[PDB]
Every structure is written in C-alpha cells, then in structure tokens.
Amino acid sequence: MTVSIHPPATLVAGDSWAWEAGAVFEDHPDPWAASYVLRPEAGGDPVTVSGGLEVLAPVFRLPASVTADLPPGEWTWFAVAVDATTDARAVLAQGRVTVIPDPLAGTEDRRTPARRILAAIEATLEGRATKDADTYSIEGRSITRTPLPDLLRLRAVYAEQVARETGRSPYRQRRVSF
Amino acid sequence: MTVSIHPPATLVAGDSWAWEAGAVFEDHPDPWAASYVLRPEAGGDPVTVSGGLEVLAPVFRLPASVTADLPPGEWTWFAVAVDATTDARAVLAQGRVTVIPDPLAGTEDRRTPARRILAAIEATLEGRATKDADTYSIEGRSITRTPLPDLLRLRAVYAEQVARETGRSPYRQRRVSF
Amino acid sequence: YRAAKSDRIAGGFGVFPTTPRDELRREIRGLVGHSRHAAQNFDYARAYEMLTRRHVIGFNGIRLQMDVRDPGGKKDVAAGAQIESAWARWGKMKNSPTPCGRLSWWGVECQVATGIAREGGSFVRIHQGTNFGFQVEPIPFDLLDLDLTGPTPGGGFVESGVEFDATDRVVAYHMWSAAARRRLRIPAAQMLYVLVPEEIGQALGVPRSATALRLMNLSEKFQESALTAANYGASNMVFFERAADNGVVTGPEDDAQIPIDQIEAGTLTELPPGVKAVSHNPAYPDAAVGPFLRQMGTSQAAGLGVSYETLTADLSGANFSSLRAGKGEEREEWRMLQRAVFEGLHDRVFSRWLPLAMLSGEVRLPLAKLDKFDAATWRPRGWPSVNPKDDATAHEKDLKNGVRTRTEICAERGRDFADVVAEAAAERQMMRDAGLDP
Amino acid sequence: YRAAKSDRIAGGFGVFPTTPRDELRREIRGLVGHSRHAAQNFDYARAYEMLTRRHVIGFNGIRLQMDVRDPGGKKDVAAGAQIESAWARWGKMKNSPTPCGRLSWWGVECQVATGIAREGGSFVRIHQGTNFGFQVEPIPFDLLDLDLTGPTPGGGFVESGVEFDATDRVVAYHMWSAAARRRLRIPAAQMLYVLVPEEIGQALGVPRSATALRLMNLSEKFQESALTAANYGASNMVFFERAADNGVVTGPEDDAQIPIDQIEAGTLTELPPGVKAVSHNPAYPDAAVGPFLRQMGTSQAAGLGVSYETLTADLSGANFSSLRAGKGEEREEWRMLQRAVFEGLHDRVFSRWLPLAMLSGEVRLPLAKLDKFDAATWRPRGWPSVNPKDDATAHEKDLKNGVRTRTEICAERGRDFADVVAEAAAERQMMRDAGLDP
Amino acid sequence: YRAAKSDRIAGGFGVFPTTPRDELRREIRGLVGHSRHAAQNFDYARAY
Known part of the structure; x- marks a missing residue:
C-alpha cells in the first residue's frame, strides 16, 4: 500500500533521527507493528525504530545517546510491518543513507579517499622530482617506478572528483568585460 | 532552521577569530548551547567556541593567545546546539577553513608544494645537463634516469600552478599598438 | 476500398464509427479552455483573432436597410428612414444599449464575433423593463x-x-x-446562440482554431528555444580546451569570491597561451529555419481557412498575381461567415426590438401593420481592389451593356444606391453655389 | 476531436477551462509593468508606439463636423460654424484645455492613444468651475x-x-x-476608460504588445551579445599557441607593471617565431543572422497586427505589389482602432462639453433645443496612394457613372466637401484679380 | 496571459510596475549626458 520512506539522506551520528513517515504502515494498521529497520551494510546488527507517537500521525524518533556508536559508512533503510497471528511480515520500503562520522568526538578522521589519493600523489611526485631513477638496481634488487606520464593522469582524474564533492567543480569562466 | 556558517575562509594563526554568526542557533535558543566546533582534519582534538556575547546578536570570539599552537593545515567547521534534558544535539552547519602557518614566529616555513617541486626540477635538470648519462652502470649497480622529455613536462604543469596561486596566471598579451 | 480499414502499421483510425456529438462536446469544453490559453500566450492565433474580427466586422459595422414593399413604388422611404434612424440612435453611445455602458452596438458585434471565432460561438441575452428596453448583454x-x-x-x-x-x-x-x-x-427567446454550422448533427460549435492549435503550441515553444540557444552560442565565445595533463588542484577557496575580469579592450591584442584554443561554432538554427518554418506554417493556414500571407506577414516571393488569387479565396470564406453571424443575431434582434420600440413609441409608426415594416436587410462591407483602373473600365463597359445594374456595384463596396443618390443631391446643392461638372 | 485534449508529450494546455477575467487582471497588472519596461529599454516596440501614434492620430488630429438636421435644406451652417469654431478655439494653446498648460487637444489625443497602446487603455477626467470649464486631465x-x-x-x-x-x-x-x-x-461621469474590445467579458484591456513582449526581450538580449562577440573576435587577432614544453617560470614580478607594446607599423614586417602561430577565425554570427532574425521577426509582427515592413524597416525584397498588399492589411487595422478611440472619448467629451459651454455662453446659441445641435461626427484622416495617375483615372470614371458621389472621395483623404467648397469660393475670388481656368 | 509574468529563464521584466516619472527623470539626466557624448564621438546619430 502507501509508503513514506524518507529518512534524511545525510544522517549524522549521535544526533536524533526522525522521518515521521506519512503512510507506510497504513496497510495492516490495526495488528501490525512499525519498524524502519536500519542495517549496516558491511557488518553490524540491524537496529530498529518503533513508534512513540501521536495517534493521528505516526512520528518516528531515535534518541541521540543511543545513536552514539553506530557504524560510520553506508546504511540501508527497509520498513517492515509484522503480525504474529498473521505469521507474516510485509515490506513496503527501500532506501540508502550514509552515516557521517561523529562530529563531536574522536582522535582522527581524514577526508574521503579522494583527498588521500591526491595528497599522496603530490608526495610521490615530490620524491621523484629529485633523485631521478627508473631502475634503482643494486645487487639483486630492482624497483622500476611507474612512468611519469602515468602518474600525472591519476592526479587529474582525482583532482576533479575532489572538486565535484566540494562543489567548486563548475568549469571556470573569465569575462573579458573590456 | 536558520544558520550562519561563515568563518573567514583564510584564518590566520595566533590571531583572534570571529564570525558573530547571525542565526544558526536560533532554533532551540532557550535551552541549547552554541559550539562552532573546529576540528583538525588529520589529527588533533576538537576545539570549541562559546558565546561571550551581547544578547540581541550573538558574537563569537576566540582569544589570540589560545590560538597559538593550533595545527597548520586544513580545518573543518561544524556548528552544534545541544541540550542535556533533550538528550539530543542538533547540527546545522558545514564548512572548511585553512590555517596559515603562524606568521609571527618560527625557524622555517617553505612555500606550498608547488614551489618545492618546481625548485627541485630546476636542480635536477642542472645536474643532468652535464655528466650526461642514461645508465651509470658500474660493477653491479645501474641507475637509469627518467627521460628528458618527461622531466620537461612536469616542469610546465607545475609552473602553471605556481602562477595560478600567485594570481599572475592570466595568459600574456602584447599590444601591437603600432 | 481497403485503404483505411485498420491501423496495421500506418493508422490510428479508431476501431468503430462514433457519434461526433459526445466526442464533440468533450472536445469543445476542453478546447474552449485550450484556445483561451493559446490565443493569450502563443502567437499567430492572436493574429487569426485580429484578422477575423476586422475582416468580418466593419469600419461602418453592419448596417440596416429595410424595404417596406415592392421597391418600384410600393416601398416608401418614410418608414425606412424612421426605422434606420431609431436603430442607429441607440446603437450610438447611450445608456440603452447594454447593462454595461462602456459599450455600444458596434462593440457588441465585434465582440460577439471574436468570441465566436475563439470559442466556436457565444450567446447574448435580452432584458426588458429595467432598460426603452431590449438591452442586449453578452454572457461568457x-x-x-x-x-x-x-x-x-x-x-x-x-x-x-x-x-x-x-x-x-x-x-x-x-x-x-x-x-x-x-x-x-x-x-x-432570451438566449440566442450563433453556431457557424459545419457538420450538421451538433448542438455546439468547436473553436475554429482547433486544427492548428496543436501545431502552434509546438511552434511557439520552438521559437522560444532557438533564440535562447543563439544567445548562448554568441556568449560563450572561445573555449580554451586542454590536453589531459594539468589543471590540478585548482584551489577551491578562490573560486567563491569572484569571476575574474580580463581586459581585451585594446585593439591589437595578440595573445600567447599555455596549451590550446578553439572557437565555438554556433549550430543555432541559422538559415535552415526560414524554409522549415514556412512549410509547417502553410499547413496551419490551410487548416484555419485563411491565406498564409494574411495570417503571417511573411509577404515574400509574391508576384501580383499570387496576391490576387490569395485574396480571392479568403474573400469567399469571409463572406460565408458574414452571412451566418448576422443570419442569426441581426434577424432575431431586429424582429424582437421592433415591437417594444413601437410600443414605447420610441419609433413613430402604427403597430398593427407590422408586416409592412417587417422586412429588414443587413448590408456587409466589401474589400477594395488593387488595380482601380481596370475595374473602372470594366464597370463602365458593364453599365453600358445593361449587364450590371448600378445597384450591384455599390453593393460590393457595401455603400448602397439610396445613399449614393442622397449624396448626389447634396452635390447638386453644392453646385448651386459654385459649379457642377463638364 | 482529441487533438488538444491534454499535455501528453506536446501540450501545456492548462487542465481545466478558466475565466479569462482573473487571469486577465493579474496578467494586466504585471504587463503594464512589463510593457513599461520593454518600450523603454528594448526596441521594435518603441517603434510600435511611434507607429500607432502617428497612423492613428493626425497631422490635423481628428476634426469635428456636426450636422444640424437633414443635410438637404434642414441642416444649416450657422450652428455648425459656431460649434466648430468654439471647439477648435480651446483646442488651440490656452489656459482652458488642461490643469497643465504645456499641452493642448491634439496633445491629449495623441497621448491618450499612446497610453492606450502600451497600457491597453487609459482614462481621462473632467473638472468644472476652476477651469470656462470641463478641462480634461489624463491620469496615469x-x-x-x-x-x-x-x-x-x-x-x-x-x-x-x-x-x-x-x-x-x-x-x-x-x-x-x-x-x-x-x-x-x-x-x-468624471472618469471614462477607453477599452479596445477584444474578448467581450473583460473589465480591462491588455497591452497590445503582450504577444511579442516575450520574443523581443529575447531578441534584444541577442543583438547585444552578438555585437560584443564580434568585437572580441576582431580584437584578439592571432593566438601564438605552443606545444607542451616551455613557458616555464614566466616571472611573476614583471607581469604587474605593464603589457608590452610592440611596433608592427612598418609595412613589410616578416616575422620569425620560436614555435608556432594560428589565426583566429571569428565565428561571430556572420551572415546567418539576416535570415534567422527575419523569421523570428515575422512572427512578432503578425502578433502585433502590423506589417513587418512598417514595424521594422527591413524594406528588402519587395516588388510594388507586395508593398501595396501590406499597406492594405494594416490600413484595415488602423481604421478599426480609429473608430474605437473616438467612439468613446470624443462622444463623451463633445456631449458633456456642450452644456457648460452653452451655459457660459462661450458658444452663442439657445440651450433648450439641444438636440438640433446634438449630432456630432468625427472625421479620421486617410493615407495617400503610391500611384496617383491610376487613382485619378478611376475616380473620374466613377464620378462619371454616378457610382461614387463626390463626397466620399474627399472623405477618404479626410478633408470633407464643405471644406472643399469654401476653398473653391476662395479660388473664385482669386480668379477675379487674375484668371480662372481653361 | 502568463507570458511575461516573471523572469524564470527568459525575462528581466522588473518585479513590480513603477512610475515612469522617477525612472524617467534619472534616465533623462543620465541620457542628456550620454547623448551629448554619442553625437559627438560616434556616428549615425550625428546623422540623425
């Protein structure tokens, strides 16, 4: 039947989460429960949200303290209504939400991989600028580095992604304006 | 609700920092605090800014002496309002700011990597101008340097970046002007 | 025989024959709504509307001439003068013509006709007592x-x-x-609906713009897109494309504050670039458009029953003859519509108006012999020719051969012979003071 | 039937029919504001405005001729002379015409008409007592x-x-x-709004420039962009492109002080370059523009109800016949507008003006028989033909066949027969001193 | 009806109707100055 799967796409950890779905569980309203199962995709144990609501409009809420240790990464949203007498469950929803690493705590969090790759390329290029060598072969060991044209290509592709995520990616424009 | 995440993008160390945000914490004004969490991206411990303000307009300020040892590099800005009775925090802001290395102190700071790579290329080319050799192979050791056409390409790409950062990058124009 | 029998690969011809009626009613409600929208927002139809109104209405409107009886000696001018005078009186600006009062008779004809084109007909209603009487009000x-x-x-x-x-x-x-x-x-009796009959079995009339309504919407959207694309094409100027090497770490922070302004005002500005350059070639429809648009356009015109040159002022590639022919075809169509609108509104109104006006004594004459003044003829106005010399020579020759009577020639213009004779008597009095003719 | 029924892939035809009224009011407030902007800043519409005013107004304005009664012998010239003289008097520059005083009657007509095109109608109000009396002031x-x-x-x-x-x-x-x-x-009574009726059920009139208002804005922005692109294309001259090798360490410091000037004045200046050269090829719309612009333009003209050649002076590719036809179509439209503006303003003003003027004795005549002098006819002025010889021959032939009366010919020009006769009497006195004609 | 109602992708038609007067006065002072310049330095207008 009707369904309202709309958790905010950007769900931040340690923060209270609410969608107050409009009509997902309107089918089987009398004897079936509300769930909004949230499952970590790679590991974890599905956590669930119940009701705690006003009767006319269901409002779904999760306490901030409980969110606490939830996994940083990608999470899935599926909504299930279930009744024991019926011995059936019914699934009406689908979605995908990402958990931002807890912003109020922790020793360290770096940027998404695009930054890491980019930073490293700058580092490796720095080394090979000096001490130039395509074969550091001594005694029985030979390293043979990746061609310089190749490294450059990687830098460009990655740099563009970092720009896209930041949102400063639109191609630049200079106005002659006399 | 409303939010005013605008720390000046160029935040200099050892200097007092202020945005005096207009409306970020207008939601939950009565029982929730002001934070403007500043966290070093690669390491560090989140430092925070409170109020110390006039009632009508909140003004956020950080003492210069406290800034002192803050990490040189990239920093993130997230604003959180939190109430214990509510057992919830609310995050309304996002941003990115860079900390210029303290300009009033220190033994040494070089330029950003673009300069380093460029300087080195000039150095390596200098060496291979004389003593020309693509295989310094003696006894059991063989070096095999990077091709000269390749080194040249690196120089050009980097030189352009240094120009862009300085801002002297616009392509040159000669006016015939009779 | 088996040409349109079904919809195998090239059809869509329904499945069974259906009554135009129900289809007609649904179609018309939807279409009145639709034409309302097109006329207001697109183009070409606004032009149809203008065209219809002007050609079918009147600088002099549509006038009334009534013949009491046989026009040899049995018709007399007194009754005629009285009736004409009375009608024209209230037709002129006055409290009497409408429960409005920004309008007049000319206005009502023109409007009822515009309404007619756009909505495939409209109605008017008459009120008596509040007022005189018989005021006519149009209803949407x-x-x-x-x-x-x-x-x-x-x-x-x-x-x-x-x-x-x-x-x-x-x-x-x-x-x-x-x-x-x-x-x-x-x-x-109170509400009369004019109908422009086409297929006979209908209780209503379709907007005459239906055939081209689909084509025009698409065309206006097209005209709006092309101009915009041309502007963009002129604006982006050159693109400085690069090979796949650098542009690395274009810093995010500088981007937000401003788009750089670079001065190229100086006349000679040879420029040196780091990598490569290219020039945008606009593909905005350039000269393809004139032929393409015209062909789709010709179709619309044929549909609306009007010559293309009148509907859209392309006015190109036409010799004298081509223009003459086009006018002739349109002239027939207008004539047909002209007869119909007044077949209905004028006849009903004149007949209805006469008794009340006679009773109010607004017009002075006796009520019992209604038939003697009952006949009423409405006169349309024709359109003038490009070559007057030829027409004049032909007309002289015709008057000579007793083939054309004098009255017919006046009729084509729409002026009328009595009018001509009164004016001639005025010219004769003007002769007494000065001179007549040689 | 099911042609415009919905908006499946090629529509937008609303969803349900709606009253043009509410849509009309919102649209008109927004549009008066919009037309105000377009006429002032774009183009073509400034031209419409100019065109409308001139064609519909008058070198002689719109004059008044009033017939006391039947023009055989029952109409007399004394009353006519008096009324005409009085009206024209205050029409000429005087304190009486307006609560301004930089204006006059001609000015008021022209202006009310301009206002009418651009804003789809405007109003005037009359004041009595402060003054004479009945001064007319237009209100925005x-x-x-x-x-x-x-x-x-x-x-x-x-x-x-x-x-x-x-x-x-x-x-x-x-x-x-x-x-x-x-x-x-x-x-x-004090405020009269002229309305140019189109669809009948309206309380207001739309700017007549609405159909082309959208197309013109886009077009002016386009004209502004293309010229600019052409200038840039001419200015950058050659680009000295380089392969991907050097240009290294172009020093930052020298850049700020000056852009170098190099002399190429000498006639022969063969030049030797370090790497390569290229020549900018301007892609600024070159000859594509003339055809493209015209086609979009034709559409606008059809929308505004005017011939393209008059609206925009392209004046190209036209034979004599094409021009004649275009004029004829526009002439009909102007005539229609002419009747309407004075259907309203003149009639109300003349009627209202007469009592006060009679009471003030400004005009000498008795008040009680108002009807005898009540009739008032306004005369428009027509536009002259390209080929006078043909017209003259046709006119002679017509006068010969009692088909055209002498009065009508004068009317088309707009001069009038009484005027002609007075002037003829003057010519006769001039004959007494010298000679008349052979 | 809704042809020029706003400035979605192809407009610029102000936002609200305004008195030509004030606009007219500012425009005219600026323009007398401007025409003075054009007539003297450009072309075509010298011709007008």
Whole structure:
C-alpha cells in the first residue's frame, strides 16, 4: 500500500533521527507493528525504530545517546510491518543513507579517499622530482617506478572528483568585460 | 532552521577569530548551547567556541593567545546546539577553513608544494645537463634516469600552478599598438 | 476500398464509427479552455483573432436597410428612414444599449464575433423593463453547464445544458449561473446562440482554431528555444580546451569570491597561451529555419481557412498575381461567415426590438401593420481592389451593356444606391453655389 | 476531436477551462509593468508606439463636423460654424484645455492613444468651475487600485477598483489616490476608460504588445551579445599557441607593471617565431543572422497586427505589389482602432462639453433645443496612394457613372466637401484679380 | 496571459510596475549626458 520512506539522506551520528513517515504502515494498521529497520551494510546488527507517537500521525524518533556508536559508512533503510497471528511480515520500503562520522568526538578522521589519493600523489611526485631513477638496481634488487606520464593522469582524474564533492567543480569562466 | 556558517575562509594563526554568526542557533535558543566546533582534519582534538556575547546578536570570539599552537593545515567547521534534558544535539552547519602557518614566529616555513617541486626540477635538470648519462652502470649497480622529455613536462604543469596561486596566471598579451 | 480499414502499421483510425456529438462536446469544453490559453500566450492565433474580427466586422459595422414593399413604388422611404434612424440612435453611445455602458452596438458585434471565432460561438441575452428596453448583454461561454444530463419521465434530454422538448425542439437553455444561485433555465427567446454550422448533427460549435492549435503550441515553444540557444552560442565565445595533463588542484577557496575580469579592450591584442584554443561554432538554427518554418506554417493556414500571407506577414516571393488569387479565396470564406453571424443575431434582434420600440413609441409608426415594416436587410462591407483602373473600365463597359445594374456595384463596396443618390443631391446643392461638372 | 485534449508529450494546455477575467487582471497588472519596461529599454516596440501614434492620430488630429438636421435644406451652417469654431478655439494653446498648460487637444489625443497602446487603455477626467470649464486631465494607469475587492451586503462587487451596482452596472471607479489621501470613489461621469474590445467579458484591456513582449526581450538580449562577440573576435587577432614544453617560470614580478607594446607599423614586417602561430577565425554570427532574425521577426509582427515592413524597416525584397498588399492589411487595422478611440472619448467629451459651454455662453446659441445641435461626427484622416495617375483615372470614371458621389472621395483623404467648397469660393475670388481656368 | 509574468529563464521584466516619472527623470539626466557624448564621438546619430 502507501509508503513514506524518507529518512534524511545525510544522517549524522549521535544526533536524533526522525522521518515521521506519512503512510507506510497504513496497510495492516490495526495488528501490525512499525519498524524502519536500519542495517549496516558491511557488518553490524540491524537496529530498529518503533513508534512513540501521536495517534493521528505516526512520528518516528531515535534518541541521540543511543545513536552514539553506530557504524560510520553506508546504511540501508527497509520498513517492515509484522503480525504474529498473521505469521507474516510485509515490506513496503527501500532506501540508502550514509552515516557521517561523529562530529563531536574522536582522535582522527581524514577526508574521503579522494583527498588521500591526491595528497599522496603530490608526495610521490615530490620524491621523484629529485633523485631521478627508473631502475634503482643494486645487487639483486630492482624497483622500476611507474612512468611519469602515468602518474600525472591519476592526479587529474582525482583532482576533479575532489572538486565535484566540494562543489567548486563548475568549469571556470573569465569575462573579458573590456 | 536558520544558520550562519561563515568563518573567514583564510584564518590566520595566533590571531583572534570571529564570525558573530547571525542565526544558526536560533532554533532551540532557550535551552541549547552554541559550539562552532573546529576540528583538525588529520589529527588533533576538537576545539570549541562559546558565546561571550551581547544578547540581541550573538558574537563569537576566540582569544589570540589560545590560538597559538593550533595545527597548520586544513580545518573543518561544524556548528552544534545541544541540550542535556533533550538528550539530543542538533547540527546545522558545514564548512572548511585553512590555517596559515603562524606568521609571527618560527625557524622555517617553505612555500606550498608547488614551489618545492618546481625548485627541485630546476636542480635536477642542472645536474643532468652535464655528466650526461642514461645508465651509470658500474660493477653491479645501474641507475637509469627518467627521460628528458618527461622531466620537461612536469616542469610546465607545475609552473602553471605556481602562477595560478600567485594570481599572475592570466595568459600574456602584447599590444601591437603600432 | 481497403485503404483505411485498420491501423496495421500506418493508422490510428479508431476501431468503430462514433457519434461526433459526445466526442464533440468533450472536445469543445476542453478546447474552449485550450484556445483561451493559446490565443493569450502563443502567437499567430492572436493574429487569426485580429484578422477575423476586422475582416468580418466593419469600419461602418453592419448596417440596416429595410424595404417596406415592392421597391418600384410600393416601398416608401418614410418608414425606412424612421426605422434606420431609431436603430442607429441607440446603437450610438447611450445608456440603452447594454447593462454595461462602456459599450455600444458596434462593440457588441465585434465582440460577439471574436468570441465566436475563439470559442466556436457565444450567446447574448435580452432584458426588458429595467432598460426603452431590449438591452442586449453578452454572457461568457464558460457559464454553460456541461454536466446537466438525464431525461425527465415526461420530458426530453437536458444534456450539455440544452432542454429538448417532446418534439425534441429547443425550448430552454441551462446556464450555470451568474456566478451565486446556480442553475437558471432560460427561455430560448432570451438566449440566442450563433453556431457557424459545419457538420450538421451538433448542438455546439468547436473553436475554429482547433486544427492548428496543436501545431502552434509546438511552434511557439520552438521559437522560444532557438533564440535562447543563439544567445548562448554568441556568449560563450572561445573555449580554451586542454590536453589531459594539468589543471590540478585548482584551489577551491578562490573560486567563491569572484569571476575574474580580463581586459581585451585594446585593439591589437595578440595573445600567447599555455596549451590550446578553439572557437565555438554556433549550430543555432541559422538559415535552415526560414524554409522549415514556412512549410509547417502553410499547413496551419490551410487548416484555419485563411491565406498564409494574411495570417503571417511573411509577404515574400509574391508576384501580383499570387496576391490576387490569395485574396480571392479568403474573400469567399469571409463572406460565408458574414452571412451566418448576422443570419442569426441581426434577424432575431431586429424582429424582437421592433415591437417594444413601437410600443414605447420610441419609433413613430402604427403597430398593427407590422408586416409592412417587417422586412429588414443587413448590408456587409466589401474589400477594395488593387488595380482601380481596370475595374473602372470594366464597370463602365458593364453599365453600358445593361449587364450590371448600378445597384450591384455599390453593393460590393457595401455603400448602397439610396445613399449614393442622397449624396448626389447634396452635390447638386453644392453646385448651386459654385459649379457642377463638364 | 482529441487533438488538444491534454499535455501528453506536446501540450501545456492548462487542465481545466478558466475565466479569462482573473487571469486577465493579474496578467494586466504585471504587463503594464512589463510593457513599461520593454518600450523603454528594448526596441521594435518603441517603434510600435511611434507607429500607432502617428497612423492613428493626425497631422490635423481628428476634426469635428456636426450636422444640424437633414443635410438637404434642414441642416444649416450657422450652428455648425459656431460649434466648430468654439471647439477648435480651446483646442488651440490656452489656459482652458488642461490643469497643465504645456499641452493642448491634439496633445491629449495623441497621448491618450499612446497610453492606450502600451497600457491597453487609459482614462481621462473632467473638472468644472476652476477651469470656462470641463478641462480634461489624463491620469496615469498605475493609479488604479487592483486590491479593492469584496462585495457589500447591500452592494455589488468592487473588484479591480470597479464599483458594480445592484444591476451590476458601472457607477463608480476606485483609483488609489493622488499619490496622499488614498482612495477616491470617482463618479463614472468624471472618469471614462477607453477599452479596445477584444474578448467581450473583460473589465480591462491588455497591452497590445503582450504577444511579442516575450520574443523581443529575447531578441534584444541577442543583438547585444552578438555585437560584443564580434568585437572580441576582431580584437584578439592571432593566438601564438605552443606545444607542451616551455613557458616555464614566466616571472611573476614583471607581469604587474605593464603589457608590452610592440611596433608592427612598418609595412613589410616578416616575422620569425620560436614555435608556432594560428589565426583566429571569428565565428561571430556572420551572415546567418539576416535570415534567422527575419523569421523570428515575422512572427512578432503578425502578433502585433502590423506589417513587418512598417514595424521594422527591413524594406528588402519587395516588388510594388507586395508593398501595396501590406499597406492594405494594416490600413484595415488602423481604421478599426480609429473608430474605437473616438467612439468613446470624443462622444463623451463633445456631449458633456456642450452644456457648460452653452451655459457660459462661450458658444452663442439657445440651450433648450439641444438636440438640433446634438449630432456630432468625427472625421479620421486617410493615407495617400503610391500611384496617383491610376487613382485619378478611376475616380473620374466613377464620378462619371454616378457610382461614387463626390463626397466620399474627399472623405477618404479626410478633408470633407464643405471644406472643399469654401476653398473653391476662395479660388473664385482669386480668379477675379487674375484668371480662372481653361 | 502568463507570458511575461516573471523572469524564470527568459525575462528581466522588473518585479513590480513603477512610475515612469522617477525612472524617467534619472534616465533623462543620465541620457542628456550620454547623448551629448554619442553625437559627438560616434556616428549615425550625428546623422540623425
């Protein structure tokens, strides 16, 4: 039947989460429960949200303290209504939400991989600028580095992604304006 | 609700920092605090800014002496309002700011990597101008340097970046002007 | 025989024959709504509207000449003068013509005609007592109730707001309302609907713009897109494309504050670039458009029953002959519409107006011999020719051969012979003071 | 039938039919504002404005001729002379025509007409006592209050500032204000709104430039971009492109001080370069523009109800016949507008003016028989033909066949037969001194 | 009806109707100055 799967796409950890779905569980309203199962995709144990609501409009809420240790990464949203007498469950929803690493705590969090790759390329290029060598072969060991044209290509592709995520990616424009 | 995440993008160390945000914490004004969490991206411990303000307009300020040892590099800005009775925090802001290395102190700071790579290329080319050799192979050791056409390409790409950062990058124009 | 039998690979011809009626009613409600939109927002149709009105209405409107009896000696001018004078009087600006009062008779004709094109017909109603009397007010088409349907046990169907009788004759109409009290059965005598007949079995008339309504919407959207693309093409100027090497770490922070302004004002500005350059070639429709647009356009014109040159002022590639032919075809169409609009409105109004006016004594004459003054002829106005010399020579030759009577020539212009003779008597008095002719 | 029924892939035809009224009011407030902007900043419309004014107004303005009664012997010239003289008097520069005093009657007609095109109509109000009397002042369109709405328990709706009655007849208007005291109910007698009727069910008139308003904005922006691109293309001259090798360490410091000037003045200047050269090829619309612009332009003209050649002076590719046809179509449109503007303003003003002027004795005549001098005819002025010889021959032939009366020919020009006869008497006196004709 | 109502992708038609007067006065002072310049330095207008 009707369904309202709309958790905010950007769900931040340690923060209270609410969608107050409009009509997902309107089918089987009398004897079936509300769930909004949230499952970590790679590991974890599905956590669930119940009701705690006003009767006319269901409002779904999760306490901030409980969110606490939830996994940083990608999470899935599926909504299930279930009744024991019926011995059936019914699934009406689908979605995908990402958990931002807890912003109020922790020793360290770096940027998404695009930054890491980019930073490293700058580092490796720095080394090979000096001490130039395509074969550091001594005694029985030979390293043979990746061609310089190749490294450059990687830098460009990655740099563009970092720009896209930041949102400063639109191609630049200079106005002659006399 | 409303939010005013605008720390000046160029935040200099050892200097007092202020945005005096207009409306970020207008939601939950009565029982929730002001934070403007500043966290070093690669390491560090989140430092925070409170109020110390006039009632009508909140003004956020950080003492210069406290800034002192803050990490040189990239920093993130997230604003959180939190109430214990509510057992919830609310995050309304996002941003990115860079900390210029303290300009009033220190033994040494070089330029950003673009300069380093460029300087080195000039150095390596200098060496291979004389003593020309693509295989310094003696006894059991063989070096095999990077091709000269390749080194040249690196120089050009980097030189352009240094120009862009300085801002002297616009392509040159000669006016015939009779 | 088996040419259009079905829809195998090149059809769509329905499956079974259906009554144009129901299809016609749904189509017309939807279309009145649609034409309302097109005329207001697109183009070409605004032009149809203008064209129709002007050609079919009148600088002098449509005038009335009434012949009492046989025009040899049995018709007399006194009654004629009186009636004409009276009609024209209230036709001129006055409190009497409408329950408005920004309008007049000319206005009502023009408007009823515009309404007619756009909505495929419209109605007017007459009121007596409040006023004189018999004031005519036009009512908007949308007022009619499409939903009232269902026959009475002792009565005929009331579908599309028309009250049929046991003879299945028209007797009442069922407009919605003033809006508030809805539903008012109105006697047919009060409400007259002009209809421009096409297929006979209809209770209503379609907007005459239906055939081109689809083509025009698409065309206006197209005209709006092309100009915009051309502007963009002129604006982006050159693109400085690069090979796949650098552009690395274009810093994010500088981007937000400003788009750089670089001065190229100086005349000679040879420029040196780091990598490569390219010049945008606009593909905005360039000269393809003139031929393409015209062909789609010709189709629309044929559909609306008007010459292309009149509908859209392309006015290109035409010799004298081509223009003459086009005018001739349109002239026939206009004539047909002209007869119809006044076949209905004028005749009903003149007849109805006469008794009240006679009773009010507004017009001075006796009521009992109504028939003697009953006849009433409405005169349309024709359009002038490009080559007057030829026409004049032909006309002289015709007058010579007793083939054309003098009256007909005047009629084509629309002026009329009595008018001509009165004016001639005035010219004769002007001769007494000075001179006549050699 | 099912041609425009919905908006599947090629539509937008609303969803349900709606009253043009509300749409019309919102559209018109927005559009008066919009036309104000276009006429002032774009182009082509400034041209419409100019065109409308000139064609519809007058070198001689619009004059007045009044016939006392039947023009055989029952109309007399004395009353006519007196009335004409009086009207023209105050029409000429004087304190009496306006509560301004930089203006005159001609000015008021021209202006009311310009206002009419651009804003789809405008109003004038008359004042008596301060002065003579009956001075007419035009009031700007924006003064009207669009917001006043809501019916009274004993009264009809006041929407769009119009006070309807229990008969739903017009009785009052509700302009904002002078601005300061806002809101003044003004009696209809004082304020008259000319309306150029199109669709009948409207309380207001749209700017006649609405159809082309969208197309023109886009077009002017385009014309502004193309010229600029062409200038840039001519200016950058050659680009000295390089392969991907050097240009290294172009020093930052030298850049700020100056852009180098290099002399190429000498005629022969063969030049040797370090790497490579290229020549900019301008892609600025070159010859594509003439055809592309014209086609979009034709559409606008059709929308505004004017021939393209008049609206924009392309004046290209036209044979004699093409020009003649175009003029003929426009002539009809102008005639229609001409009748309407004076259908309203002149008639109301002449009628209203007469009593006060008679009472002030400004005009000498008795007040009680108002009807004898009541009739008043306004005369428009026509436009002259390209080929006079043909016209003259045709006219002679027509005068010969009693088909055209002498009066009509004069009317087309707009001069009039009485004028012609007075002038002829003057020519006869000039004959006494010298000679007449052979 | 809704042809020029706003400035979605192809407009610029102000936002609200305004008195040509004030606009007219500012425009005219600026323009007398401007025409003075054009007539003297450009072309075509010298011709007008």
